[PDB]
Amino acid sequence: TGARTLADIKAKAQLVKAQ
Amino acid sequence: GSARCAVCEGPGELCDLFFCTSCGHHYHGACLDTALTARKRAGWQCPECKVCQACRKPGNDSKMLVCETCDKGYHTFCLKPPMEELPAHSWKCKACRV
Ligand SMILES: [Zn+2]
Ligand SMILES: [Zn+2]
Ligand SMILES: [Zn+2]
Ligand SMILES: [Zn+2]
Prior knowledge:
The complex is a heterodimer of chains A (about 20) and B (about 100).
Chain A: H1 4-18
Chain B: E1 18-19, E2 26-27, H1 29-32, H2 38-41, E3 64-66, E4 73-75, H3 94-97
Antiparallel strand pairs in B: 1-2, 3-4
The structure holds zinc ion (4 copies).
One zinc ion (ZN) binds near residues 8 and 31 of chain B.
């Protein structure tokens, strides 16, 4: 179901972290 | 040690949260979108310090496949079964798939 796996997990992490 | 949430900011107990061994800080499943499992409950390296199980290096999040149940890193260019492209679906253990 999409590559949301690490892509959503870590990438979103950057959004919330960098934010 | 409070070991507050690594990415979400907030105090929490050290037992029901995923405690990263290297970082030393724990975190909620909702913050990193990690399923609550015994394998990860012990303490799995958060994406902030995850590594490939082939070259042991981070990065390539969109090109790296991570197991939902257990903690494993697979590189689309050097994972156990190397692939020529990024799977449109999920590629993890059978249990991980579900
Ligand atoms: Zn949190
Ligand atoms: Zn960590
Ligand atoms: Zn797995
Ligand atoms: Zn690799």
